[PDB]
Amino acid sequence: GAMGSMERASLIQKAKLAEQAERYEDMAAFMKGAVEKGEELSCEERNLLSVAYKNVVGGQRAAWRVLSSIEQKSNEEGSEEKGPEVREYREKVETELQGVCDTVLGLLDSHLIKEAGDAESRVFYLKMKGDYYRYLAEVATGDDKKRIIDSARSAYQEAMDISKKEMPPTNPIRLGLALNFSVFHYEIANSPEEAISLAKTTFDEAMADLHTLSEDSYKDSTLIMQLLRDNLTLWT
Amino acid sequence: GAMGSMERASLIQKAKLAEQAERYEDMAAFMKGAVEKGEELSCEERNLLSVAYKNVVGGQRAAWRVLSSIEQKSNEEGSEEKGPEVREYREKVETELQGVCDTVLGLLDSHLIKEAGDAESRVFYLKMKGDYYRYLAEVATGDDKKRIIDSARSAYQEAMDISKKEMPPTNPIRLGLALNFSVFHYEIANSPEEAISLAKTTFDEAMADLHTLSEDSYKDSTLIMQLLRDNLTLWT
Amino acid sequence: GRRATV
Amino acid sequence: GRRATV
Ligand SMILES: [Mg+2]
Ligand SMILES: [Mg+2]
Ligand SMILES: [Mg+2]
Ligand SMILES: [Mg+2]
Ligand SMILES: [Mg+2]
Ligand SMILES: [Mg+2]
Ligand SMILES: [Mg+2]
Ligand SMILES: [Mg+2]
């Protein structure tokens, strides 16, 4: 690894500078280097890792959707043949995206998940595993599509099981996990009713627990609860 | 070059797809590959080249300014010592930025400028040479700073001389050249009076020539004239 | 609007 | 606002 010679603390410091400069590819490389030092990540460090890769893959996914839409239009009746270039370039972006997902999944497997024993870390990493398998599922079209989808489902389901046992219903990790698993049901697993049920139950159970929270925790939880409500409004 | 095996027309097609997907690093690599085919660029192709690199270097410059500001604050009295990391990371971004400028300047020197005989191409490329030397000047601090500044000045001055002889005062390339050379005077050459005089004279001479233009050309010219006015308002 | 994930 | 270049 190109970060093998840099101190763990320096990698973390530079990840924070990269975030301020909106240099998310650098931020991800610094955080990958920090993970590869082999020590567990603190809560703040886990969130630096997730912010970095979410921004990198988010740009790739948005670009992939633009190119996919152009490719789809090219294959409609009446569309002039323009050659292989659109497919080739969509494939190039797709391969890069898959590489980033494989990198994240590799960090989780070697060895973040196996060392994560507290609920906040374990649920966080399993949510990430579900998310990055879900991004692979967004572009999958072949023999492995069902297994990719099931890998996302299985990771999310383990995270849900732990979060229900070990976290309050207002915990922001639990809420974001539920938000994303609901989206998985809606748009990956062809299960809109499950998506709506999960979002509604998650919202209602969080509502009932807000009275236990400080003002700052209340703000954290209600922010994600509003995202659940936004999705429910879109879907109903 | 990694683009050596791809057809010129395919590189151009992919540059346009990359623009739509906001993948400006890819767009720049495709356009560099197209330039390296050795043929002159059409007007549309020149603008694809400039859009790609302007976006790439624009992101680098914005990041460099964020990091420079943090580094400056770290060196104020009362600031806690945090180690070499801020300087190192600012240097990393700076070196990448300088590499992109050197790449663009290299394409202009090998061999875009020497083959550009029409005013619209020659002025466009000389403006680009001035711009990329100006971006080098923004980060230069050493023995070569004066020569970098003079290289920007000389390129802009040749472009100005050609544009005055060969283009109408409303030509958008002429207007953008003047806008940027005025900014060069203001913030690189420590010549705010020259910056203001150039912007004012450029605006007034364009105003007097608008009556010759079609509606579409009028829109093109007035857009840049508004930028000259914006700068004059900021500076006076 | 596009559905939300976090 | 930041000065304009194009
Ligand atoms: Mg050490
Ligand atoms: Mg036809
Ligand atoms: Mg593929
Ligand atoms: Mg129903
Ligand atoms: Mg050929
Ligand atoms: Mg102190
Ligand atoms: Mg340097
Ligand atoms: Mg004066």
Side-chain angles (χ1 to χ4, degrees), chain A residues 1-72 74-75 78-81 83-142 144-163 166-218 220-236, chain B residues 1-72 74-75 78-81 83-142 144-163 166-218 220-236, chain C, chain D:
Chain A
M3 308 294 185
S5 63
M6 201 183 309
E7 289 275 20
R8 189 184 186 282
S10 299
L11 288 165
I12 298 298
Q13 183 180 354
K14 291 179 184 181
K16 291 176 188 173
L17 293 171
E19 187 181 24
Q20 296 186 71
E22 299 175 73
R23 291 275 290 198
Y24 294 103
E25 172 184 296
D26 288 348
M27 192 181 174
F30 291 139
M31 289 318 291
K32 174 172 189 293
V35 170
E36 292 174 344
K37 296 304 175 181
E39 301 292 341
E40 297 186 35
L41 300 193
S42 72
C43 185
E44 177 171 11
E45 294 162 357
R46 288 191 299 270
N47 284 278
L48 292 169
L49 177 70
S50 68
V51 163
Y53 279 107
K54 163 183 73 203
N55 276 272
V56 170
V57 80
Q60 297 174 318
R61 291 164 65 210
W64 185 95
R65 298 199 283 273
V66 165
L67 299 172
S68 196
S69 171
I70 294 170
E71 184 179 18
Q72 255 84 75
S74 84
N75 289 311
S79 290
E80 192 66 43
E81 176 60 44
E85 291 85 356
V86 167
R87 176 186 54 74
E88 286 171 350
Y89 185 48
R90 185 272 298 158
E91 280 174 355
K92 170 195 185 86
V93 173
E94 185 172 300
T95 298
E96 192 188 295
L97 184 160
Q98 293 169 320
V100 169
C101 295
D102 289 347
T103 291
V104 172
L105 293 167
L107 295 173
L108 295 171
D109 202 46
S110 297
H111 296 278
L112 289 169
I113 288 171
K114 68 177 56 67
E115 295 295 354
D118 292 355
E120 303 55 45
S121 58
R122 195 163 184 82
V123 173
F124 184 95
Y125 294 136
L126 288 166
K127 178 187 173 289
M128 195 174 210
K129 184 176 182 173
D131 288 336
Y132 284 85
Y133 275 112
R134 172 164 60 85
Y135 306 148
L136 291 176
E138 289 178 344
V139 305
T141 63
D144 280 336
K145 176 94 181 293
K146 290 184 181 159
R147 275 177 285 269
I148 291 170
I149 289 174
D150 203 72
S151 289
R153 183 206 57 73
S154 179
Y156 285 138
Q157 187 55 63
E158 197 190 327
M160 290 290 289
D161 293 343
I162 298 167
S163 72
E166 301 298 340
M167 280 170 175
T170 50
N171 180 277
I173 303 162
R174 182 165 164 183
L175 292 172
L177 165 63
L179 181 75
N180 284 20
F181 192 28
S182 164
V183 169
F184 169 84
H185 287 307
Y186 191 91
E187 79 177 21
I188 309 294
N190 198 26
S191 301
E193 292 178 329
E194 187 73 14
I196 290 163
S197 187
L198 180 51
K200 197 183 181 313
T201 292
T202 302
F203 183 97
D204 290 345
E205 281 194 296
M207 180 67 41
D209 184 56
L210 292 172
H211 74 275
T212 67
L213 302 182
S214 71
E215 172 173 320
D216 283 17
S217 295
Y218 181 92
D220 293 334
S221 298
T222 57
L223 184 178
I224 308 163
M225 279 174 72
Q226 183 63 56
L227 302 177
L228 291 160
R229 165 74 38 220
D230 292 342
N231 284 0
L232 283 166
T233 297
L234 190 55
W235 296 337
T236 64
Chain B
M3 308 294 185
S5 63
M6 201 183 309
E7 289 275 20
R8 189 184 186 282
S10 299
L11 288 165
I12 298 298
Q13 183 180 354
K14 291 179 184 181
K16 291 176 188 173
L17 293 171
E19 187 181 24
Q20 296 186 71
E22 299 175 73
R23 291 275 290 198
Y24 294 103
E25 172 184 296
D26 288 348
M27 192 181 174
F30 291 139
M31 289 318 291
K32 174 172 189 293
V35 170
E36 292 174 344
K37 296 304 175 181
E39 301 292 341
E40 297 186 35
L41 300 193
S42 72
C43 185
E44 177 171 11
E45 294 162 357
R46 288 191 299 270
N47 284 278
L48 292 169
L49 177 70
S50 68
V51 163
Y53 279 107
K54 163 183 73 203
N55 276 272
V56 170
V57 80
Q60 297 174 318
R61 291 164 65 210
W64 185 95
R65 298 199 283 273
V66 165
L67 299 172
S68 196
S69 171
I70 294 170
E71 184 179 18
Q72 255 84 75
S74 84
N75 289 311
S79 290
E80 192 66 43
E81 176 60 44
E85 291 85 356
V86 167
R87 176 186 54 74
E88 286 171 350
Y89 185 48
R90 185 272 298 158
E91 280 174 355
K92 170 195 185 86
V93 173
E94 185 172 300
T95 298
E96 192 188 295
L97 184 160
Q98 293 169 320
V100 169
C101 295
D102 289 347
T103 291
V104 172
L105 293 167
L107 295 173
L108 295 171
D109 202 46
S110 297
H111 296 278
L112 289 169
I113 288 171
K114 68 177 56 67
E115 295 295 354
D118 292 355
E120 303 55 45
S121 58
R122 195 163 184 82
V123 173
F124 184 95
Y125 294 136
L126 288 166
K127 178 187 173 289
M128 195 174 210
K129 184 176 182 173
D131 288 336
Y132 284 85
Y133 275 112
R134 172 164 60 85
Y135 306 148
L136 291 176
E138 289 178 344
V139 305
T141 63
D144 280 336
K145 176 94 181 293
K146 290 184 181 159
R147 275 177 285 269
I148 291 170
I149 289 174
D150 203 72
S151 289
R153 183 206 57 73
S154 179
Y156 285 138
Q157 187 55 63
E158 197 190 327
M160 290 290 289
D161 293 343
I162 298 167
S163 72
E166 301 298 340
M167 280 170 175
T170 50
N171 180 277
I173 303 162
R174 182 165 164 183
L175 292 172
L177 165 63
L179 181 75
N180 284 20
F181 192 28
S182 164
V183 169
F184 169 84
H185 287 307
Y186 191 91
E187 79 177 21
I188 309 294
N190 198 26
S191 301
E193 292 178 329
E194 187 73 14
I196 290 163
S197 187
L198 180 51
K200 197 183 181 313
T201 292
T202 302
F203 183 97
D204 290 345
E205 281 194 296
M207 180 67 41
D209 184 56
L210 292 172
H211 74 275
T212 67
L213 302 182
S214 71
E215 172 173 320
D216 283 17
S217 295
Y218 181 92
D220 293 334
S221 298
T222 57
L223 184 178
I224 308 163
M225 279 174 72
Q226 183 63 56
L227 302 177
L228 291 160
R229 165 74 38 220
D230 292 342
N231 284 0
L232 283 166
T233 297
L234 190 55
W235 296 337
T236 64
Chain C
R2 187 162 155 83
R3 81 303 180 280
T5 52
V6 296
Chain D
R2 187 162 155 83
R3 81 303 180 280
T5 52
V6 296

